[PDB]
Amino acid sequence: QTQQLHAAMADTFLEHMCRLDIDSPPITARNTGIICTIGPASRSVETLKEMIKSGMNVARLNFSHGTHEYHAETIKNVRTATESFASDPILYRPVAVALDTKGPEIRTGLIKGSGTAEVELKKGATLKITLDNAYMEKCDENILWLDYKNICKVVEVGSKIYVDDGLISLQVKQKGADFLVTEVENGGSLGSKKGVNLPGAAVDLPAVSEKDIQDLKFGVEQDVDMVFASFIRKASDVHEVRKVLGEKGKNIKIISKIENHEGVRRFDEILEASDGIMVARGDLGIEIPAEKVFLAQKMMIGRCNRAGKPVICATQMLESMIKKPRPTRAEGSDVANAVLDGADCIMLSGETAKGDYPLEAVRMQHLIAREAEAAIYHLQLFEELERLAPITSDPTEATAVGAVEASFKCCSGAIIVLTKSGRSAHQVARYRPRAPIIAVTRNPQTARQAHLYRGIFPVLCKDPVQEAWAEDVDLRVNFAMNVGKARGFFKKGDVVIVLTGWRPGSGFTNTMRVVPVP
Amino acid sequence: QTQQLHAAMADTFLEHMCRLDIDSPPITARNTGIICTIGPASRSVETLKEMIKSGMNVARLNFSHGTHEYHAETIKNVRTATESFASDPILYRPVAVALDTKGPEIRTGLIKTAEVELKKGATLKITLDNAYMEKCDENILWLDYKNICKVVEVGSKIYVDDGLISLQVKQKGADFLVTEVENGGSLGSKKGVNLPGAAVDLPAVSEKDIQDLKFGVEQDVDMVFASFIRKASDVHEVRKVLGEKGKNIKIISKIENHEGVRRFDEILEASDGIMVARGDLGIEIPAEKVFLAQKMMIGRCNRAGKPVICATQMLESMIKKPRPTRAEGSDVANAVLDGADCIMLSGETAKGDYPLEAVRMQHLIAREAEAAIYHLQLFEELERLAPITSDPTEATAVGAVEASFKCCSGAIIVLTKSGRSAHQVARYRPRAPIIAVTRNPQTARQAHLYRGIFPVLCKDPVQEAWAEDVDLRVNFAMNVGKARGFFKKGDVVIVLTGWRPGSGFTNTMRVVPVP
Amino acid sequence: QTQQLHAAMADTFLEHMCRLDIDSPPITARNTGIICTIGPASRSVETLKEMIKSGMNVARLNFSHGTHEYHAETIKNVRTATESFASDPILYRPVAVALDTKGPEIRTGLIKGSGTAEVELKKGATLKITLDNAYMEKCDENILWLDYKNICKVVEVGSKIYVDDGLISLQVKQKGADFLVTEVENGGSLGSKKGVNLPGAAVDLPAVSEKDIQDLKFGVEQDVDMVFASFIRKASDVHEVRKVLGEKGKNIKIISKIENHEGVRRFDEILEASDGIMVARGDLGIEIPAEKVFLAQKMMIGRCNRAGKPVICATQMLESMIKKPRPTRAEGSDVANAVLDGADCIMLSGETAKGDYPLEAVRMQHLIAREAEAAIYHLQLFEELERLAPITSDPTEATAVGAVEASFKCCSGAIIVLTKSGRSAHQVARYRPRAPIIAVTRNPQTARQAHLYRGIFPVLCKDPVQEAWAEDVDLRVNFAMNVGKARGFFKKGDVVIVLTGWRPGSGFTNTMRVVPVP
Ligand SMILES: O=P(O)(O)OC[C@H]1O[C@](O)(COP(=O)(O)O)[C@@H](O)[C@@H]1O
Ligand SMILES: O=P(O)(O)OC[C@H]1O[C@](O)(COP(=O)(O)O)[C@@H](O)[C@@H]1O
Ligand SMILES: O=P(O)(O)OC[C@H]1O[C@](O)(COP(=O)(O)O)[C@@H](O)[C@@H]1O
Ligand SMILES: [K+]
Ligand SMILES: [K+]
Ligand SMILES: [K+]
Ligand SMILES: [Mg+2]
Ligand SMILES: [Mg+2]
Ligand SMILES: [Mg+2]
């Protein structure tokens, strides 16, 4: 009568839905990664500590805004808050840092005069668009400037142009070279520097601009753990980002953001080149008809799970929590269905960057992820992941799937794995056990990147190596036991699964033990 | 393209069938146990060595016939043939000895070693005057069941000689029944008699049975096949007689009548395994219903995780000819597909002209059939029907089998003192052979009852360091597998072990390359 | 608690097996066809009448033996027996006649002396096989003649040779021209004119010999319904057979007998070209290792089920009943499992052609089939057959599959179908309903050939055509009900499914009705 174990026993999906209970409380452990965007509301040290206690795993910096120096000062504070807890290495939480590139964004110019100044637009009214730099800080209700110099080559008559994140639409009546005349189809106020999207068009900007180059190089300087590459359209876009990171950034992980039609059409070659995927729903839902977005979301998450690569669901998950302390019912549903669909991580944007309730937002996500994890139908999920996954002779693969079937058989409080690269923990997570995966590593980077995988609770063993390998192994296992008790995941005399290798070095995980908690 | 691995991939049973292929060769290992009835044809030491090499696992002695001195000698020969292979521990094969009780049979009398001949429509009086107990003929017939006249009615049907001859009852009384013959045939001496519609109140454990089970205990048999078990208390009666001294002897109940079928669930619970006794069962219930009973029992046994044995007329034509009929081919293969742990030969090995050919042919067929099982479905069914547990050992067993499928392992190697750890694995029915390494030679002989368990008996003395004693026995298993052709250097096997000595602590699963 | 209805309710195959109950009695209807081979024991009119009441649906004539005059008299008798029941059109049962060809057999010659003579062959003995026609009637223990002139070309030292249904095995020790020297391996006594098999060998005998041609012409003259073509090795073999049947016998059904390695290897092209398949296990279990036959059986059955074509299981199903009035447990089990495998028809050979208990064997097949039909796991079968079925716009297909599902939901007593060609009845049977399919037709050939499909109970309407079509339809629907009532398939108030088209002529079946029985 807990963890939805009654519904876990159903022999159909529908009987499984029918058995779900609001009075079956979940376990302590939460498997889904939380990712928070840091900005004015959340960049203070004091508050960042509170985000970490609340459940933040990764901190994301949007490089569509702000300066290398401002960002460097966010990071510094994230690292200070994080290390504030190394005091007790048993309760320490590694906290990753991710870099979100500008990429091929299209923006409007400044509104003439005051900073905040917006101009009201009205349906049917007229708007001329120019590329004349005279006008770039002189935008208003008749004339508007755009930073995409080649716009006219690619937008025809009939075309639609959305501005301010889908909320203002315009139609292309007449067009020269230099300028476009438009009729306003949906009005509203327009401020300075707003996102422009061109649904019909083949936008021809480079995947990595010189601005992107400098930003990527800065992130290599700063030892960030991952990069969220914007607007990826094809594999070669991914490789180009991989080259700009080069040898020095070779361990930093690349998440292609999919946020347009081409990204979606060529998803297979992009996923093959990337380390993970983000479903970038804001842009994506302007670049395609908003009603189609749920399908791309489910296509991308499914294929990532089929391929054992992390997928993040993003944007407007709890929008209303920017202004209010509780979410709407669609927001509640949406976070929960992201987890149920299969998402490894879930992202907060404005809600933590600039909102009036960043901590509450983090908590709500933590609370909902945990309910929805219990609600997942593991029976079917696990069987469908066994079937699709190929056959191999890799003993770690066999050991990984054995540990998972065993975790179901005995309702183990956790599956513990020792791992240098993380790779042995990733092989377990791909099969989606209910129980949490406590990944014990010495490598601080592996610990931080581990958060991209559903279920991995990384822990960082700071202790020196023993002279006897067998003793060193057992000390790490036992470290995972102490973390699990201290966290409430399990208590003494509960059974856990433990994974280890037949010899030192990566790639040898082959041993699975069913072990009582000491 | 080997082991029907193509068929094993399919999404449906029907596509699985379509992908079955006569040119996909089976692995060398054979998982289904073979039991052979020993008799005039096969009781010599010379013939028994060859039966073992051809794949016999359990020697059955039928106590419906023979004297204790006779069976004691049979055993002595089996133990001799078996021990002749201890020369090389790596190739030694444990052989079990099983005792199969007479039970409450009914038999005819002697004849006036000659045979009279009943014709359809003819008249036959049946009698209980013991003066006639050694002169039966076309007219008069003696049976040794004294209450026969109390339980029969006007019209009831009597089958004689394993169902070949049949009589109907035209008039009753006491001492006499008058019967019309319905199926003619050549009656002989002391033949089986069956009274389908009737409830026979003979003891389950008769005076003779009691002395025969004692023989079992003294002779040190491994298991007992108790005939005509009708209800759970019959099995308790048997367990009692075996008593304290006989308590590690497994009791396999033989279902051969309508009541045993009906009270199957309770008999299963009390028994350590089941034998589907198709000979008698197929006269006591209509022959067309046997396959239903058989599949019901194999099914409930696989569900309970207890061994079940298919028996009787599996290769009947091979008593006289050296190839079986096509039916006989089919039937053996379907018993394995149904889920039988063991298959059995009777007359084929006891008294036929081709005992070794019959054993070989069970070995070949079982090996083909085990590769044609749709494990995808079978494993998911057994895994699901399994109640969740706290036992680390169940978890470890299921983890092992899951891993044996993901990497198509050459075997699952298990150390076990009592057998129990190997049994847990075999309940889930891996494709891969389970090589169970033990020092207890009784554990090794009984382990044949379970599908896929190839017991190996370790004769090495105990190393003083426990980890080294564990490795040695793992390596021994490896050498057995290499030598028998189950696998070779660099293949993967699963290895299952515990974290300390003593029963009940198996908790460790390793995926290991063969050295 | 009848028809194994408790077992039909189970969620898994394994639970389905567990609930099979020997006290859950079957319905009256038997769905699997029974094909009896005719010969001395069964060819009297008196005996044939009773074969028919006992359940023979098809009369099989084995052309490997006997003259045209003798077979003509057999057919005459088949039809006298059959037509003896036409007095009562309600109880009248179409009985088909099938011709089984000789084909490329290899046969020995005559034993010297007595026509009835045998010789002993003893393990270790030398036996010489000659082609010199001198010896064709002087065969004995030292010298054996056979009728395949090219045998020496196709065998080598080491080869095996089986004689008389695999009883006797020889091993070639030397290969001359015009002879072989062999060692007897399995001895046994040998009589005259016995079949020879060469497992190793690329036998080259012609698909359709001069004698097969005489024979097929004769079948066309006698208006047989189906041909069983022996030793089909490839599609062109089937074509060759079709030519000889030509126009006069274009609608005569060709069932390819698979009895050798090449047939099995090329099964798909043979299947496509044929109207049906027989698994001829006698020859097959000598041409391939005996332990592999059950594989071939199940491959062929599954593939014919998948394609919707009749498949017959044949040979030694009840062999002991040639001498004993009750079958062995393996035989009882073999038959059940052929039905459970998915076979449309099961066949009897010596059991009915020369044995002592022809009626009893026919009755046993009836009884076992009826039990085994109930024990089928229809939930899974029907789900998979629907699943595998290619998708079609064909209204008749959609109607068939709706009728089958409807028959399941209301546990109907029959599926009544009107059909000219048989086709619409076949499309129901391919989906494998529990309920018997009663096919009403005015076409006597259609009736006789429907016996090759599991479930079809053909009924032959002799009444003339009503002027008003709608009444002509009702009249045949109503003749089906009378047949069902009289046979005890159902009774007044039971529901049945009735299938019709929207106009006369073949191909228009599109109407399913759920109908209480008056
Ligand atoms: O996940 P990875 O990178 O393969 O790391 C797993 C490795 O960790 C170990 O358990 C311990 O190795 P170290 O002692 O070198 O950390 C190995 O046995 C195993 O092969
Ligand atoms: O299957 P069983 O009878 O419980 O025996 C399994 C036992 O065998 C072992 O692997 C070896 O024990 P021993 O050293 O006592 O033979 C134990 O670790 C384990 O508990
Ligand atoms: O199976 P077939 O040969 O298509 O026969 C089915 C045909 O039988 C009918 O039900 C009626 O046939 P009739 O021409 O005999 O009236 C048609 O509606 C239907 O098209
Ligand atoms: K960005
Ligand atoms: K007995
Ligand atoms: K023939
Ligand atoms: Mg974007
Ligand atoms: Mg018996
Ligand atoms: Mg043939």
Residue numbers in the entry:
A (entry chain D), C (entry chain A): 14 to 531
B (entry chain B): 14 to 125, 129 to 531
Report text from the authors:
The crystal structures of H391Y·Ser·FBP (R = 14.4%, Rfree = 21.7%) and R399E·Ser·FBP (R = 18.0%, Rfree = 21.8%) were determined through the molecular replacement method. The model consists of four subunits, and each monomer of H391Y and R399E displayed an overall homologous fold similar to that of the wild-type; each monomer (531 amino acids) comprised N region (1‒43), A domain (44‒116 and 219‒389), B domain (117‒218) and C domain (390‒531). The active site is situated at A domain in close proximity to B domain, and the FBP-binding (431‒437, 482, 489, 513‒522) and Ser-binding (43‒46, 70, 106, 464‒471) sites were situated in the C domain. However, substitution by E399 essentially forfeits these contacts because of an anionic carboxyl moiety, even in the presence of FBP, and thus a conformer that lost allosteric regulation. R399E shows a diminished salt-bridge network near the C–C interface. As such, R399E exhibits an FBP-resistant allosteric activation as seen in the coupling-function analysis. H391Y and R399E exhibited a reduced level of FBP activation profile and decreased values of Qax (3.56 and 4.10). Each of PKM2s was immunoprecipitated using anti-HA antibodies, followed by Western blotting analysis.
PKM1 is constitutively stable and active as a tetrameric form, whereas PKM2 is allosterically controllable and can exist as a tetramer, dimer, or monomer in response to various effectors. The introduction of a well-known allosteric activator, fructose 1,6-bisphosphate (FBP), for instance, shifts a less active T-state into a fully active R-state tetrameric form. PKM1 and PKM2 share an overall homologous fold but differ in a 45-amino acid stretch in the C-terminal domain of PKM2 (389‒433 residues of PKM2).
